[PDB]
Amino acid sequence: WMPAYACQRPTPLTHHNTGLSEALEILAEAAGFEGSEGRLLTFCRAASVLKALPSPVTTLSQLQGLPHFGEHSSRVVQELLEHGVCEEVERVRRSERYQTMKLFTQIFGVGVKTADRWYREGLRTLDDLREQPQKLTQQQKAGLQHHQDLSTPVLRSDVDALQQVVEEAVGQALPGATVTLTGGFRRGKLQGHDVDFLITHPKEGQEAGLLPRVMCRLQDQGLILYHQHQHSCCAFERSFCIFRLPQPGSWKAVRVDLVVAPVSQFPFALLGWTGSKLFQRELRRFSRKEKGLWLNSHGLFDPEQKTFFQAASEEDIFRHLGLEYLPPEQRNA
């Protein structure tokens, strides 16, 4: 038996059902491209169940008793087991709609709504986008300029080099300020699409004005290709960057998100930013539906009492929600 919420079970980085989960995730992604959010979530949940299993699914009889495995997902696994291929998945892969939506949405600064609009307006290729620069934001222009590098998986070796320069800039700007690697790399991933860093200082308020100083230092070192700074609006101060990472004999553009949180909110920010995306969605749904609390990256709010939970760590937050603690490497839902 396996619990229904992804936040109630460990999901390790590596598992026994990668073929099956990949197929389901292609269908989830395609659903998202069509605005079918219910179907996306359904396929994502089924895939995440497969990732939690201790053994490969070799026969359809092994699906018995598993949550989030309705008819459609079961059929997909069945076809794969029996024929080595699922016709629906193959049709999606070969479809111009899917291929174009994948192409566009992968670009830095492009979401589903933008990609769909462009598709509807007859754009198909990266060259098509470059021929219509008036349709692009400055962020999207930068994404197109560096698209080859940005499509190349970011490696742990890149992360370690980037963490060094970010730590050096932070330390020189403000002694005592800290840099914490978050995102997929905190969960143990060997690769990723970017590097996510969370910045704070143990004295609340000492982090004010830190990020612009950090960016000035990095820019002066030639390490920044693109930088968009945004102050907290609603809602953390952040900088969406493309770094120029030096390599032996060359260099590589790499997406980096730098996020500043006040130390009082750090545990919530670390939890939120560590993911996985599905793990956090499930954690938020659990908090709301089972405990009547609203969890986000800033806090944990009781809407009846109008109170916020004071957490010193991620462990505190899990405990407060009545969940066994899962370290980041078991959040790979």
Ligand SMILES: Nc1ccn([C@H]2C[C@H](O)[C@@H](COP(=O)(O)OP(=O)(O)OP(=O)(O)O)O2)c(=O)n1
């Ligand atoms: N729609 C989103 C987007 C992001 N996040 C959170 C969870 C992610 O882990 C984190 C960082 O976002 P990324 O897109 O960088 O996700 P990962 O770092 O997990 O994956 P990758 O290896 O592709 O960078 O922010 C989220 O909850 N919901």
Ligand SMILES: [Mn+2]
């Ligand atoms: Mn990331």
Ligand SMILES: [Mn+2]
């Ligand atoms: Mn990111």
